[PDB]
Symmetry: D2
Subunit: 234 residues, 4 copies
């Protein structure tokens, strides 16, 4: 795609602030995040109509009550952000979050073990997830691998039953840029998988470019600012 | 302007690679730059049809012969990048480059001395530049000032007779982003002055966004990559 | 302490490369780390006589056989690096690594829930660790808190029965610098707890400075370079 | 040298705060620096006994009166920080500063033109400088070149009549670290040239390590903090 292609595609897909808001997974995954910050995250998600609230396992559970009351979908990260705890540990972690009402999981598999291990690991998590009717997004840290390796990873995710593939944890890499988004999307979309872009998305512009590049969902810890920035540059 | 506004404005103005190449001030201002590098810069500027080649005073002089032969317009930075040498020094520097054939000057005034001082100083080099029919672009390091102060600097530049105002040196600040570009453009355009965006412009998308925000000229040390990036994202 | 004080204290404690190597927790906690990399880490730990090898739960388990064969002590990070999975999850994770032979745990508690919560949580893993005669190092992300808050965290760690307190995860903060190390040490040592410095320790000089500031143990992903750098600056 | 060597050497040379203060060239070379900041720089230089005040040409001239009254030696940067204005322009610049009372010049030659050009250029500046009994420090941007090239540069400076060689402009590179300081010192000292380290020196510790590595003079824009940091770590 050309530069013009990505800009035009973004414009074709985001006609209104509501369109953008509906694609944003409002996130809070900071070592400093308090219960108060989490409450504010969920309330604002409802206030602005964001796709869902993304939290760590503990806060997902603690805030599930309020989220249910306000009708805010909850997404929890799993084995995040390093992803090198054993499969059993991630399942116990996913279980507690699923039992609490979380309907989506942003999973970090043990990527460095290779495509086959990722397939076996993700399949195990998707299995638990399906029993709750939960959606699984697989974080692939795309900036770390070449295309051949990213393809193998996307394919293992597909074969595992995953719905969406995510570009980055936003910790070890950043994947909110058009190039990284396109690298993942050019592989995921043909297979019918959704695409989530995350990492450094701070402006409405950043958001529109990511969508134009192929992202279906926008992950960001600055959801409100991204939305306001979309409406007005300054 | 909204995020959509700047994207659309960028698309409306840059329909072809030629349109882009025509607005690009291909630059080389590095402590590592060699004569060989400069020859390559000027030759490729000719190859790609870039707006001009931007160089330091010494290389502007050394390459003037080649530039003339290949029909490449030359632009020299003056008092770059700190701008705290006295006017007398800057005038001697400009005089030498003008004597060599440079038709544009990207001047860094002693900004921190205040709007009035900038007015007097720029009025001086503009007077000199005019005798050679050369254009003057005033670098204002926009990211350093609030809107009130930037307006004062833009106004002084206008009063002094300058043609264009530039967002940044790319050294002490980076002003290639849409917000910075708009901040300057919103003030300068109503006054009939041109706007040049510089600082961190590495992709074709960066270029299109800067133009959409109001930049007439794009300054970049990666002219070739920006152009190729414009044609193909990856 | 004065700058001279920390330098002198560092020199007084590290007379030989062996003294240094003996205080180094050779670490590998990367999303890119492969089994091969881990084998190399453990083998070189043996070669250089490093204090132990620090790994993620999965690799701690996979390498336990080799580690035992080469007589390399194993330390696993727990709930690393964000620490916001519930205690139950962290306990399962620790249990598996302890079952494999790990004798030390570098634990990341859910710091942002407050001192009291940290006390209860750490008391839990310490109880488990004790049944295996394993040592527990509590990561406090010192750079994130003021002295009053850090003191509260140090005190909770002490009350919970932890042996050592660690300055940082090396991910959300970097705590290998003398100031951070002293901030922690000034609080922990008077309480009889050990101090581990981690985050950005790349040179032998970084190591000596951290020890001079009060670090008993040095955590680093560049163990070999730190040692060689200790022997020769260049 | 070993890590211990550099720490011990620093301690041998900096026994008191006064020792450190006497080696510090208190600097202010910011695009934001105002006349008020400059006055404060000079007053404090006297207050703490720093070696001298380092300023841009314009401020050197504007503050010379006060500096003379307080007995504060003045050092001006020349052709700083890019160094690619012609020799004649730098001489006019050096002249105005010398005529004002500046007794030291921190010169940035056009390094990328090669050793021979640097020799011819520096000789020209040293010539003007000697007539005022002024000292010349030649900035070599050491981090940019290999040892062979740095040696050629140090030798051209020596042959040119320069007194001191400086590691960095602090703009295009940073040379306050032990490694970079040693690289320059191991070449300069045998030839009897002084050594100035600059770039990122913010702590008393940073200062002591640089001296231990061979720096005779410490350039820093945080002179007061470096000195206070030397006396007390926190």
């Amino acid at each position: 795609p050309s530069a013009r292609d990505i800009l035009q595609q973004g414009l074709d897909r985001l006609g209104s602030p509501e369109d953008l808001a509906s694609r944003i997974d409002s996130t809070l995954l900071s070592p400093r995040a308090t219960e108060e910050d989490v409450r504010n995250l969920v309330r604002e998600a409802s206030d602005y109509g964001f796709r869902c609230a993304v939290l760590t396992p503990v806060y997902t559970v603690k805030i599930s009550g309020l989220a249910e009351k306000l009708g805010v979908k909850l997404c929890s990260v799993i084995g995040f952000p390093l992803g090198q705890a054993p499969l059993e540990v991630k399942l116990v972690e996913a279980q507690t979050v699923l039992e609490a009402g979380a309907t989506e999981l942003d999973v970090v598999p043990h990527l460095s073990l290779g495509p086959e291990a990722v397939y076996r690991e993700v399949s195990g998590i998707v299995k638990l997830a399906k029993s709750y009717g939960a959606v699984v997004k697989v974080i692939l840290e795309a900036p770390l691998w070449d295309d051949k390796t990213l393809s193998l990873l996307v394919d293992s995710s597909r074969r595992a039953g995953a719905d969406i593939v995510k570009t980055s944890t936003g910790v070890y890499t950043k994947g909110g840029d058009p190039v990284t988004v396109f690298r993942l999307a050019s592989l995921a979309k043909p297979l019918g998988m959704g695409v989530k872009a995350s990492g450094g998305i701070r402006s409405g512009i950043d958001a529109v470019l990511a969508v134009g590049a192929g992202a279906d969902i926008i992950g960001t810890s600055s959801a409100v600012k991204v939305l306001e920035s979309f409406k007005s540059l300054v």
